[PDB]
């Protein structure tokens, strides 16, 4: 906005802004017993099995 005092005039301006992503990683560890993975595949024998 111009005005009538002795101040210098104002040229038009421009602003240029740069933004970027941030990478984030997540990890969880599960252990499964070897007998538990095995007997999911072993065959049915009896009602107690």
């Amino acid at each position: 906005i111009a005005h009538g005092d002795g101040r210098r005039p104002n040229k038009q301006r421009q602003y240029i802004v740069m933004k970027a992503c941030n990478k984030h990683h997540i990890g969880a560890e599960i252990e499964l017993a070897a007998a538990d993975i095995e007997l999911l595949f072993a065959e049915k024998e009896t009602p107690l099995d």
Partner: protein
Amino acid sequence: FMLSGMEAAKAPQTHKVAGVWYGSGSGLADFIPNLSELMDTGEFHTLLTPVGPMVQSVHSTFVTKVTSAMKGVGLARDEPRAHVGLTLPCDMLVDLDESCPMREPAG
């Protein structure tokens, strides 16, 4: 431990246990009459080939059948789907990595 003849206080715990599984120590030394002489020239370590942990022992009166495990994890006989781990007495084993830390790499 019984064929060696080492003293009591250097392995204070298994000396009681290995004294009750065996006699005075001459029940086994009658098989190897050269234990006085295998120790002099030092040929005893060239006559042991380490084999691995037990898996199963079928015991009879005069003869015991022993099945060991080489190359890896031996499969357990009586408990199914199990794995026989190796047992050492706490007395013989000397741990070697021990620090306050007062840092060593994991692996």
